[PDB]
Coordinates of C-alpha atoms and ligand atoms in Angstrom, one line a residue:
Chain N
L1 CA -17.8 -16.7 -23.5
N2 CA -21.3 -17.5 -22.3
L3 CA -22.2 -14.0 -21.2
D4 CA -25.9 -14.5 -20.6
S5 CA -25.3 -17.6 -18.4
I6 CA -22.8 -15.6 -16.3
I7 CA -25.2 -12.7 -15.8
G8 CA -27.9 -15.3 -15.0
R9 CA -26.1 -17.0 -12.2
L10 CA -25.1 -13.6 -10.9
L11 CA -28.6 -12.1 -10.8
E12 CA -30.0 -15.3 -9.5
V13 CA -29.2 -14.6 -5.8
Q14 CA -31.3 -11.5 -6.0
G15 CA -33.0 -11.3 -2.6
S16 CA -31.8 -14.5 -1.0
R17 CA -30.4 -13.8 2.4
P18 CA -27.5 -11.3 2.9
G19 CA -24.2 -12.5 1.5
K20 CA -25.0 -15.6 -0.6
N21 CA -21.9 -16.1 -2.8
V22 CA -21.9 -16.7 -6.6
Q23 CA -18.9 -18.8 -7.6
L24 CA -18.1 -18.5 -11.3
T25 CA -15.2 -20.4 -12.9
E26 CA -11.9 -18.6 -12.9
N27 CA -12.1 -19.1 -16.7
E28 CA -15.4 -17.3 -16.9
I29 CA -13.9 -14.4 -14.9
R30 CA -10.8 -14.1 -17.1
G31 CA -13.2 -13.9 -20.0
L32 CA -15.0 -11.0 -18.3
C33 CA -11.6 -9.3 -17.7
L34 CA -10.1 -9.8 -21.1
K35 CA -13.1 -9.1 -23.3
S36 CA -13.9 -6.0 -21.3
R37 CA -10.3 -4.9 -21.2
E38 CA -10.6 -4.9 -25.0
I39 CA -13.7 -2.6 -24.9
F40 CA -12.0 -0.2 -22.4
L41 CA -9.1 0.4 -24.7
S42 CA -11.1 0.8 -28.0
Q43 CA -13.1 3.4 -26.1
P44 CA -11.6 6.8 -25.1
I45 CA -9.9 7.3 -21.8
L46 CA -12.1 10.4 -21.4
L47 CA -15.6 9.4 -22.2
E48 CA -18.3 11.6 -23.7
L49 CA -21.8 10.4 -22.7
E50 CA -25.3 11.9 -23.0
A51 CA -28.4 11.9 -20.8
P52 CA -30.4 10.2 -19.7
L53 CA -28.3 8.1 -17.4
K54 CA -28.0 7.1 -13.8
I55 CA -24.8 7.8 -12.0
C56 CA -23.3 6.0 -9.0
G57 CA -20.3 6.3 -6.7
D58 CA -18.5 3.9 -4.5
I59 CA -19.9 0.3 -4.2
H60 CA -17.0 -1.2 -2.3
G61 CA -18.0 -4.9 -2.5
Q62 CA -21.4 -4.5 -1.1
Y63 CA -23.1 -6.6 -3.7
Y64 CA -26.6 -6.9 -2.4
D65 CA -26.7 -3.1 -2.2
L66 CA -25.6 -3.0 -5.9
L67 CA -28.6 -5.2 -6.6
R68 CA -31.0 -2.9 -4.8
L69 CA -29.3 -0.2 -6.7
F70 CA -30.4 -1.7 -10.0
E71 CA -33.6 -2.9 -8.5
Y72 CA -34.4 0.8 -7.8
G73 CA -33.1 2.5 -11.0
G74 CA -33.6 -0.4 -13.4
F75 CA -31.4 -3.2 -14.6
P76 CA -29.7 -2.6 -18.0
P77 CA -30.4 -1.7 -20.6
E78 CA -33.5 -0.2 -19.1
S79 CA -31.3 2.6 -17.8
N80 CA -27.9 3.9 -19.0
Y81 CA -25.2 3.9 -16.3
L82 CA -22.0 5.6 -15.3
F83 CA -20.1 4.3 -12.3
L84 CA -17.5 6.4 -10.6
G85 CA -15.1 3.7 -9.5
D86 CA -14.3 2.0 -6.2
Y87 CA -16.0 -1.3 -7.0
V88 CA -13.9 -3.6 -4.9
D89 CA -12.3 -3.6 -1.4
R90 CA -13.8 -3.4 2.1
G91 CA -17.2 -4.9 1.2
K92 CA -17.9 -8.6 1.6
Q93 CA -18.4 -9.5 -2.0
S94 CA -16.1 -7.7 -4.3
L95 CA -15.9 -10.6 -6.7
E96 CA -19.7 -10.7 -7.5
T97 CA -19.7 -6.9 -7.7
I98 CA -16.9 -6.4 -10.2
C99 CA -18.1 -9.4 -12.2
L100 CA -21.6 -8.2 -12.6
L101 CA -20.2 -4.8 -13.6
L102 CA -17.6 -6.1 -16.1
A103 CA -20.4 -8.3 -17.5
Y104 CA -22.8 -5.5 -18.2
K105 CA -19.9 -3.5 -19.7
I106 CA -19.6 -6.3 -22.2
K107 CA -23.3 -6.9 -22.9
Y108 CA -24.2 -3.3 -23.4
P109 CA -20.8 -1.6 -24.2
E110 CA -22.7 1.6 -25.2
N111 CA -25.3 1.9 -22.5
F112 CA -23.0 1.1 -19.6
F113 CA -19.8 2.8 -18.5
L114 CA -17.2 2.3 -15.8
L115 CA -14.6 4.8 -14.5
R116 CA -11.5 4.1 -12.4
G117 CA -11.6 4.7 -8.6
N118 CA -8.5 4.8 -6.5
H119 CA -9.3 1.2 -5.3
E120 CA -9.0 0.0 -8.9
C121 CA -5.2 -0.3 -8.3
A122 CA -3.0 -3.2 -7.2
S123 CA -1.3 -0.8 -4.7
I124 CA -4.4 -0.8 -2.5
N125 CA -6.3 -3.8 -3.9
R126 CA -3.8 -6.0 -2.1
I127 CA -4.4 -4.3 1.2
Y128 CA -8.1 -3.5 1.6
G129 CA -9.4 -7.0 1.0
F130 CA -9.9 -7.6 -2.7
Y131 CA -6.6 -9.5 -3.3
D132 CA -7.5 -11.4 -0.1
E133 CA -10.9 -12.3 -1.6
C134 CA -9.4 -13.6 -4.8
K135 CA -6.7 -15.5 -2.9
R136 CA -9.4 -17.1 -0.7
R137 CA -11.9 -18.0 -3.4
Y138 CA -9.6 -18.4 -6.4
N139 CA -5.9 -17.7 -6.7
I140 CA -3.2 -15.1 -6.9
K141 CA -2.8 -15.3 -10.6
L142 CA -6.5 -14.3 -11.1
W143 CA -6.0 -11.1 -9.0
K144 CA -3.0 -10.3 -11.1
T145 CA -5.4 -10.5 -14.1
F146 CA -7.9 -8.0 -12.6
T147 CA -5.1 -5.5 -12.1
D148 CA -4.4 -5.8 -15.9
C149 CA -8.0 -5.0 -16.6
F150 CA -8.2 -2.1 -14.1
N151 CA -5.0 -0.6 -15.6
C152 CA -7.1 -0.1 -18.7
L153 CA -10.1 1.7 -17.2
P154 CA -11.4 5.1 -18.2
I155 CA -10.4 8.0 -15.9
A156 CA -13.2 10.6 -16.5
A157 CA -16.5 11.2 -18.3
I158 CA -18.1 14.4 -19.6
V159 CA -21.9 14.1 -19.8
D160 CA -23.5 16.4 -22.5
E161 CA -20.5 18.8 -22.4
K162 CA -21.9 20.1 -19.1
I163 CA -21.2 17.6 -16.3
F164 CA -17.6 16.5 -15.6
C165 CA -17.2 13.2 -13.8
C166 CA -14.4 11.4 -12.0
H167 CA -13.8 9.4 -8.8
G168 CA -11.7 11.9 -6.8
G169 CA -11.6 15.5 -8.1
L170 CA -9.6 18.2 -9.8
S171 CA -5.8 18.6 -10.1
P172 CA -3.3 21.5 -10.1
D173 CA -2.1 19.8 -13.3
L174 CA -5.4 19.5 -15.1
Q175 CA -5.5 22.6 -17.2
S176 CA -6.0 21.2 -20.7
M177 CA -8.8 18.7 -21.3
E178 CA -6.4 17.0 -23.6
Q179 CA -3.9 16.2 -20.9
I180 CA -6.4 13.5 -19.9
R181 CA -6.7 12.1 -23.4
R182 CA -2.9 12.0 -23.7
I183 CA -2.7 9.5 -20.9
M184 CA -1.6 6.1 -22.2
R185 CA -3.1 2.8 -21.2
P186 CA -2.5 0.4 -19.7
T187 CA -1.1 2.3 -16.7
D188 CA -0.6 2.1 -12.9
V189 CA -1.9 4.8 -10.6
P190 CA 1.1 7.0 -9.6
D191 CA 1.9 8.8 -6.4
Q192 CA 1.9 12.2 -7.8
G193 CA 0.8 13.9 -11.0
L194 CA -2.5 14.4 -12.9
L195 CA -3.7 10.8 -13.0
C196 CA -3.2 10.3 -9.3
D197 CA -5.1 13.5 -8.3
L198 CA -8.0 12.6 -10.5
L199 CA -8.7 9.6 -8.3
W200 CA -7.5 10.9 -4.9
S201 CA -8.3 14.6 -4.5
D202 CA -11.0 16.0 -2.3
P203 CA -13.2 19.1 -1.8
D204 CA -12.7 21.1 1.4
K205 CA -14.8 24.0 2.7
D206 CA -12.0 25.3 4.9
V207 CA -9.4 25.1 2.2
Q208 CA -8.5 28.1 0.0
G209 CA -6.8 27.0 -3.3
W210 CA -4.8 23.8 -3.1
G211 CA -4.2 22.3 0.4
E212 CA -2.7 19.1 1.7
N213 CA -4.8 16.0 1.7
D214 CA -5.4 14.2 4.9
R215 CA -5.2 10.9 3.0
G216 CA -1.4 11.4 2.6
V217 CA -1.7 11.5 -1.2
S218 CA -2.8 14.1 -3.7
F219 CA -4.3 17.4 -2.7
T220 CA -7.5 19.1 -1.5
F221 CA -9.2 21.9 -3.4
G222 CA -11.6 24.7 -2.4
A223 CA -14.8 26.2 -3.8
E224 CA -12.8 28.8 -5.7
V225 CA -10.9 26.1 -7.7
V226 CA -14.3 24.5 -8.6
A227 CA -15.9 27.7 -10.0
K228 CA -12.7 28.8 -11.8
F229 CA -12.6 25.4 -13.5
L230 CA -16.3 25.1 -14.4
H231 CA -15.9 28.5 -16.0
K232 CA -12.7 27.7 -17.9
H233 CA -14.3 24.8 -19.7
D234 CA -18.0 25.9 -19.8
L235 CA -19.1 23.1 -17.4
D236 CA -22.1 23.4 -15.0
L237 CA -21.4 20.5 -12.6
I238 CA -18.7 18.2 -11.2
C239 CA -19.8 14.8 -10.2
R240 CA -17.5 12.6 -8.1
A241 CA -17.5 10.0 -5.2
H242 CA -14.5 8.9 -3.2
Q243 CA -16.0 10.2 0.1
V244 CA -18.7 8.9 2.4
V245 CA -21.6 11.3 2.8
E246 CA -24.5 10.9 5.3
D247 CA -27.3 11.3 2.8
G248 CA -25.7 9.6 -0.2
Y249 CA -25.4 12.9 -2.1
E250 CA -23.8 16.1 -0.8
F251 CA -23.3 19.5 -2.4
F252 CA -20.1 21.6 -2.4
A253 CA -19.2 25.0 -3.8
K254 CA -22.9 25.7 -3.5
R255 CA -24.2 22.9 -5.8
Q256 CA -21.4 23.6 -8.3
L257 CA -20.2 20.1 -7.3
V258 CA -21.9 17.0 -5.9
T259 CA -20.5 14.0 -4.1
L260 CA -22.1 10.6 -4.7
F261 CA -21.8 7.5 -2.5
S262 CA -23.8 4.5 -3.4
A263 CA -22.8 2.1 -0.6
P264 CA -25.1 2.3 2.5
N265 CA -23.3 1.7 5.8
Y266 CA -19.9 2.0 4.2
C267 CA -18.6 -0.6 6.7
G268 CA -21.5 -0.9 9.1
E269 CA -19.8 2.1 10.7
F270 CA -21.9 4.9 9.2
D271 CA -25.7 4.3 9.0
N272 CA -25.4 6.5 6.0
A273 CA -27.7 6.2 3.0
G274 CA -26.7 5.5 -0.6
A275 CA -27.5 7.8 -3.5
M276 CA -27.7 7.7 -7.3
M277 CA -28.2 10.6 -9.6
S278 CA -31.0 10.4 -12.2
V279 CA -30.2 12.7 -15.1
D280 CA -33.0 13.1 -17.8
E281 CA -32.3 14.4 -21.3
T282 CA -33.0 17.9 -20.1
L283 CA -30.3 17.8 -17.4
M284 CA -32.8 17.7 -14.6
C285 CA -31.0 15.8 -11.9
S286 CA -32.7 13.9 -9.2
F287 CA -31.3 11.7 -6.3
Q288 CA -32.8 8.3 -5.8
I289 CA -31.9 7.2 -2.3
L290 CA -31.2 3.7 -0.9
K291 CA -31.9 4.0 2.8
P292 CA -29.8 1.8 5.1
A293 CA -31.6 -0.3 7.8
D294 CA -32.9 0.6 11.2
Chain C
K1 CA 38.0 -18.3 12.4
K2 CA 35.0 -19.2 10.2
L3 CA 31.3 -19.7 10.1
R4 CA 29.5 -21.8 12.6
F5 CA 26.6 -21.6 15.1
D6 CA 25.7 -22.0 18.8
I7 CA 23.1 -23.5 21.1
Chain M
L1 CA 22.1 19.7 15.9
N2 CA 22.3 18.8 19.5
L3 CA 22.8 15.1 19.0
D4 CA 23.7 14.2 22.6
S5 CA 20.7 16.0 24.0
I6 CA 18.4 14.2 21.7
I7 CA 19.8 10.7 22.5
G8 CA 19.6 11.8 26.2
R9 CA 15.9 12.6 26.2
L10 CA 15.3 9.4 24.2
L11 CA 17.1 7.0 26.5
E12 CA 15.6 8.8 29.5
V13 CA 12.4 6.8 29.5
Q14 CA 14.4 3.6 29.9
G15 CA 12.2 1.4 32.1
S16 CA 9.4 3.8 33.0
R17 CA 6.1 2.1 32.4
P18 CA 5.2 0.7 28.9
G19 CA 4.6 3.4 26.2
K20 CA 5.9 6.6 27.7
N21 CA 6.3 9.0 24.8
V22 CA 9.3 11.1 24.0
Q23 CA 8.4 14.2 22.1
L24 CA 11.3 15.9 20.3
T25 CA 10.8 19.1 18.2
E26 CA 10.0 18.6 14.6
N27 CA 13.2 20.6 13.9
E28 CA 15.3 18.1 15.9
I29 CA 13.8 15.2 13.9
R30 CA 14.4 16.9 10.5
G31 CA 18.0 17.2 11.7
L32 CA 18.2 13.5 12.3
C33 CA 16.7 12.8 8.9
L34 CA 18.8 15.2 6.8
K35 CA 22.2 14.6 8.5
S36 CA 21.7 10.9 8.4
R37 CA 20.4 11.0 4.9
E38 CA 23.8 12.6 4.1
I39 CA 25.6 9.6 5.7
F40 CA 23.5 7.0 3.9
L41 CA 24.4 8.4 0.5
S42 CA 28.2 8.9 1.1
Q43 CA 28.1 5.2 2.2
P44 CA 27.7 2.4 -0.3
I45 CA 24.2 1.0 -1.1
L46 CA 25.8 -2.4 -0.5
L47 CA 27.6 -2.3 2.8
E48 CA 30.7 -4.4 3.7
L49 CA 30.9 -4.9 7.4
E50 CA 33.1 -7.0 9.7
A51 CA 32.6 -8.9 12.9
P52 CA 32.0 -8.6 15.7
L53 CA 28.5 -7.2 15.5
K54 CA 25.0 -7.8 16.7
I55 CA 22.3 -8.2 14.0
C56 CA 18.5 -7.4 14.4
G57 CA 15.4 -7.9 12.4
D58 CA 12.0 -6.2 12.5
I59 CA 11.4 -3.7 15.4
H60 CA 8.1 -2.4 14.1
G61 CA 7.6 0.5 16.5
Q62 CA 7.9 -1.5 19.7
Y63 CA 10.3 1.0 21.3
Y64 CA 10.6 -0.5 24.8
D65 CA 11.6 -3.8 23.2
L66 CA 14.2 -1.9 21.2
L67 CA 15.5 -0.6 24.6
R68 CA 15.6 -4.1 26.1
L69 CA 17.4 -5.1 22.9
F70 CA 20.2 -2.7 23.6
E71 CA 19.9 -3.3 27.3
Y72 CA 20.7 -6.9 26.5
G73 CA 23.4 -6.7 23.8
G74 CA 24.8 -3.3 24.9
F75 CA 24.2 0.3 23.9
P76 CA 26.5 1.7 21.2
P77 CA 29.3 1.9 20.7
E78 CA 29.8 -1.0 23.1
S79 CA 28.5 -3.3 20.3
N80 CA 28.5 -2.8 16.6
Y81 CA 25.0 -3.1 15.0
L82 CA 23.3 -4.1 11.8
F83 CA 19.5 -3.7 11.6
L84 CA 17.6 -5.4 8.8
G85 CA 14.8 -2.8 8.3
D86 CA 11.2 -2.6 9.2
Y87 CA 11.6 0.0 11.9
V88 CA 8.2 1.7 11.9
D89 CA 4.6 0.7 11.4
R90 CA 2.2 -1.4 13.5
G91 CA 4.1 -0.8 16.8
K92 CA 2.9 1.9 19.2
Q93 CA 6.0 4.1 19.1
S94 CA 7.5 4.3 15.6
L95 CA 8.7 7.8 16.2
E96 CA 10.9 7.1 19.2
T97 CA 12.2 4.0 17.4
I98 CA 13.3 5.5 14.1
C99 CA 14.7 8.5 15.9
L100 CA 16.9 6.6 18.3
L101 CA 18.1 4.6 15.3
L102 CA 18.8 7.6 13.0
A103 CA 20.5 9.2 16.0
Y104 CA 23.0 6.4 16.6
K105 CA 23.6 6.2 12.9
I106 CA 24.8 9.8 13.1
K107 CA 26.7 9.5 16.4
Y108 CA 28.6 6.3 15.3
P109 CA 28.4 6.3 11.5
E110 CA 31.0 3.5 11.4
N111 CA 29.8 1.2 14.3
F112 CA 26.1 1.3 13.5
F113 CA 24.3 0.4 10.3
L114 CA 20.7 0.4 9.0
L115 CA 19.2 -1.4 6.0
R116 CA 15.9 -0.8 4.3
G117 CA 12.9 -3.0 5.1
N118 CA 9.7 -3.0 3.0
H119 CA 8.0 -0.8 5.6
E120 CA 10.6 1.9 4.9
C121 CA 8.5 3.0 2.0
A122 CA 5.7 5.7 1.7
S123 CA 3.6 3.1 -0.1
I124 CA 3.0 1.2 3.1
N125 CA 4.1 3.8 5.7
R126 CA 0.9 5.6 5.1
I127 CA -1.2 2.6 5.7
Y128 CA 0.2 0.6 8.6
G129 CA 0.3 3.4 11.1
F130 CA 3.5 5.4 10.7
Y131 CA 2.1 8.2 8.7
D132 CA -0.8 8.2 11.1
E133 CA 1.7 8.5 14.0
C134 CA 3.4 11.5 12.4
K135 CA 0.1 13.1 11.5
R136 CA -1.1 12.7 15.1
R137 CA 2.0 13.9 16.9
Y138 CA 3.5 16.3 14.3
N139 CA 2.4 16.9 10.7
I140 CA 2.1 15.5 7.2
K141 CA 5.1 17.5 6.0
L142 CA 7.4 15.7 8.5
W143 CA 6.3 12.3 7.3
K144 CA 7.1 13.4 3.8
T145 CA 10.6 14.1 5.1
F146 CA 11.1 10.6 6.5
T147 CA 10.2 9.1 3.2
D148 CA 13.0 11.3 1.7
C149 CA 15.4 9.8 4.2
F150 CA 14.2 6.2 3.8
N151 CA 14.6 6.5 0.0
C152 CA 18.3 6.8 0.6
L153 CA 18.8 3.7 2.9
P154 CA 21.2 0.9 2.1
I155 CA 19.6 -2.3 0.6
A156 CA 22.0 -5.1 1.7
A157 CA 25.1 -5.8 3.7
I158 CA 27.9 -8.5 3.4
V159 CA 29.6 -9.3 6.6
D160 CA 33.2 -10.6 6.3
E161 CA 32.5 -11.7 2.7
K162 CA 30.7 -14.7 4.1
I163 CA 27.3 -13.5 5.5
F164 CA 24.8 -11.8 3.1
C165 CA 22.1 -9.7 4.7
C166 CA 18.9 -8.0 3.6
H167 CA 15.3 -7.6 4.8
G168 CA 13.4 -9.9 2.5
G169 CA 15.6 -12.3 0.5
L170 CA 16.9 -13.3 -2.9
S171 CA 15.7 -12.4 -6.4
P172 CA 15.5 -14.1 -9.8
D173 CA 17.2 -10.9 -11.1
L174 CA 20.1 -10.9 -8.5
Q175 CA 22.8 -12.6 -10.4
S176 CA 25.6 -10.0 -10.3
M177 CA 26.6 -8.5 -6.9
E178 CA 27.1 -5.3 -8.9
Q179 CA 23.4 -5.1 -9.9
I180 CA 22.9 -4.0 -6.3
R181 CA 25.7 -1.4 -6.4
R182 CA 24.3 0.0 -9.7
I183 CA 21.0 1.0 -7.9
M184 CA 20.7 4.7 -7.8
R185 CA 19.5 6.6 -4.7
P186 CA 17.3 8.2 -3.8
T187 CA 14.7 5.7 -5.0
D188 CA 11.2 4.4 -4.3
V189 CA 10.5 0.7 -3.7
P190 CA 9.0 -0.6 -7.0
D191 CA 6.4 -3.3 -7.6
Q192 CA 8.7 -5.6 -9.5
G193 CA 12.3 -6.0 -10.2
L194 CA 15.5 -6.6 -8.2
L195 CA 15.1 -3.9 -5.5
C196 CA 11.5 -4.9 -4.7
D197 CA 12.4 -8.6 -4.3
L198 CA 15.3 -7.8 -2.0
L199 CA 12.8 -6.4 0.5
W200 CA 9.8 -8.6 -0.1
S201 CA 10.8 -12.2 -1.0
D202 CA 10.4 -15.2 1.3
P203 CA 11.9 -18.7 2.0
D204 CA 9.5 -21.6 1.5
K205 CA 10.1 -25.2 2.3
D206 CA 7.3 -26.4 0.0
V207 CA 8.5 -24.3 -3.0
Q208 CA 10.9 -25.6 -5.6
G209 CA 12.6 -22.8 -7.5
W210 CA 10.7 -19.5 -7.7
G211 CA 7.1 -19.6 -6.6
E212 CA 4.3 -17.0 -6.1
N213 CA 4.4 -15.0 -2.9
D214 CA 1.3 -15.0 -0.7
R215 CA 2.0 -11.4 0.0
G216 CA 0.8 -10.4 -3.5
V217 CA 4.2 -9.0 -4.3
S218 CA 7.6 -10.4 -5.3
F219 CA 8.3 -14.2 -5.1
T220 CA 9.1 -17.1 -2.8
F221 CA 12.3 -19.1 -3.2
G222 CA 13.3 -22.6 -2.1
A223 CA 16.2 -24.3 -0.4
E224 CA 17.8 -25.0 -3.8
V225 CA 18.0 -21.3 -4.7
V226 CA 19.7 -20.6 -1.4
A227 CA 22.5 -23.2 -1.9
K228 CA 23.0 -22.4 -5.6
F229 CA 23.5 -18.8 -4.6
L230 CA 25.7 -19.2 -1.5
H231 CA 27.9 -21.3 -3.9
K232 CA 28.0 -18.8 -6.8
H233 CA 29.3 -16.1 -4.5
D234 CA 31.2 -18.1 -1.9
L235 CA 28.9 -17.1 1.0
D236 CA 28.2 -19.3 4.0
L237 CA 25.0 -17.6 5.3
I238 CA 22.0 -15.5 4.4
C239 CA 20.6 -13.4 7.2
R240 CA 17.2 -11.7 6.8
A241 CA 14.0 -10.8 8.7
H242 CA 10.6 -9.8 7.2
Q243 CA 8.8 -12.8 8.8
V244 CA 7.7 -13.5 12.3
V245 CA 9.2 -16.6 13.9
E246 CA 8.2 -18.3 17.1
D247 CA 11.7 -18.3 18.7
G248 CA 13.1 -15.1 17.3
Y249 CA 15.5 -17.0 15.0
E250 CA 14.6 -19.7 12.6
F251 CA 16.7 -21.8 10.2
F252 CA 16.0 -22.6 6.6
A253 CA 17.8 -24.6 3.9
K254 CA 19.3 -26.5 6.8
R255 CA 21.0 -23.5 8.5
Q256 CA 22.1 -22.2 5.1
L257 CA 19.8 -19.2 5.9
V258 CA 18.4 -17.8 9.1
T259 CA 15.4 -15.5 9.8
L260 CA 15.7 -12.9 12.5
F261 CA 12.7 -11.2 14.2
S262 CA 13.5 -8.8 17.0
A263 CA 10.0 -7.7 18.1
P264 CA 8.4 -9.9 20.7
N265 CA 4.6 -10.3 20.4
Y266 CA 4.6 -8.8 16.9
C267 CA 1.2 -7.3 17.6
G268 CA 0.3 -9.0 20.9
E269 CA -0.9 -11.7 18.6
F270 CA 2.0 -14.0 18.7
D271 CA 3.6 -14.6 22.1
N272 CA 6.8 -15.1 20.1
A273 CA 10.2 -14.2 21.3
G274 CA 12.6 -11.7 19.8
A275 CA 16.1 -12.7 18.7
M276 CA 19.4 -11.0 17.9
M277 CA 22.5 -12.6 16.4
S278 CA 25.8 -12.2 18.1
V279 CA 28.7 -12.6 15.7
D280 CA 32.2 -12.6 17.2
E281 CA 35.3 -12.0 15.0
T282 CA 35.6 -15.8 14.3
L283 CA 32.1 -15.9 12.8
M284 CA 30.8 -17.9 15.8
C285 CA 27.1 -16.9 15.8
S286 CA 24.9 -17.0 18.9
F287 CA 21.3 -16.0 19.4
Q288 CA 20.5 -13.7 22.4
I289 CA 16.8 -14.0 23.0
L290 CA 14.3 -11.4 24.4
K291 CA 11.5 -13.6 25.8
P292 CA 8.0 -12.0 25.6
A293 CA 5.9 -12.0 28.8
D294 CA 3.7 -14.6 30.5
Ligands
CL301 CL1 -10.6 5.3 -0.5
CL302 CL1 5.6 -7.6 6.9
MN303 MN1 -12.1 6.2 -3.0
MN304 MN1 -14.0 4.7 -1.3
MN305 MN1 8.7 -6.9 6.4
MN306 MN1 7.6 -6.8 9.1

């Protein structure tokens, strides 16, 4: 596997008109999938990282914004990274995006980490334009290979025993931090239960306790649930993505939780900015912002 | 009394 | 449960401008769901019907075309009916459609039959506009109730021991006609396996044996598979829907299989006609056509 060559051809289009494709060989991509899939398994399903590190939310195929995102916070291993899932779908270039990410996960397995968003699942991959991208540029079989790699992704990360991170949010079933570690991989993302909620759930100001989720899957939780949880596990922050926010970062439960969204103009239907959370060794968090375009 | 089709 | 009243308010909009809603009470609809769900279970998962009967394919929420469909072949119990699934989603009025159908299933449990299309599943209901319809006109809970009713639908029907009917097609795993009867309800529609294939699979001229399905789920089968199957079970026809066809009916494997699609202008993106297969007691099949609109 010629990792450096791959990364090279990928980074090459850096600032060269919006949406210039990078077409690796399907054999190179399988390499990325299988050799990273290895790494994901040998590593814990519930990661335990340490500052400093930059954190990112949904990228959703917007590859050139992922470039600006590194261009702004520093390409690896300059900066350590945690991504909160939702890498493919909706965007124009899911293939480049997920490849560059799976590549860095292999190059720097210890300074680069990837969690699993709800869109890292064949159930919605097929629908929201990732399976289509594969089918168009490569073939069905290859997409079937990604979903064998995604099925082995980490679900959550706990930075410095203080920040708890996952794509969606909390779950009525998440009481023991071990329930997460007991989750066996590889695995699909269910309709109900702990794993599902971890990737689907949402914060809601108006909700008290556990309410129905407008998504039609999982629940919504309120500011009480957040505090009662941060207190049961001695955590000071919850960092998650999953939801578009105007500024790129947005607070909930009075800064007891933050929402990160790294893709500016989620579909050209938002004019929202993208954010990324810088976390120095002292746990002093700052929000580098990738403005859209006016 | 068995299977066939019209036009 | 005031069944007659319900049917009455439903049929009332018959020919009264395109897309005039009929808003039952959520309590009436639960009645339709629960009292039909009862019927579906007490009846076999693999039905055994007898001519005469009209057969229909996808309706996909196009309610006024479902009216014309009865207006043309006769409202029950004038004619016996078998529907091949895909009742909701995409169309404008899934609610009226599925209600009128669940109603007739209760009124004439023995002269009216409904199978399960791939869209009778919460996995895609949510996405392609049925869950949205419920959420808009009623509430999430109600949609959650439909998916408890769908989960108890019949999978296939064998008319007069000669015609074999299902929404999608055949499966590499369907060797014993008992494998279907062994299927326990209520049940979700899986990603792989027999049940899935029965609702997802497709015919393909260019395929020899079992090929990959462009849908990203299940397989495609060729004309050999059809013949070798009709011969292993002494059947003379396979009737299925699942796929749009220009004329409403379309032959495959040289009339050894037919595809029925009952929704004209599947999305206003086809200008295709809708078909329905009249089958008299002698097994003389004719195709009543519902032309679109020019
Ligand atoms: Cl999403
Ligand atoms: Cl379909
Ligand atoms: Mn998401
Ligand atoms: Mn998202
Ligand atoms: Mn279908
Ligand atoms: Mn359909």
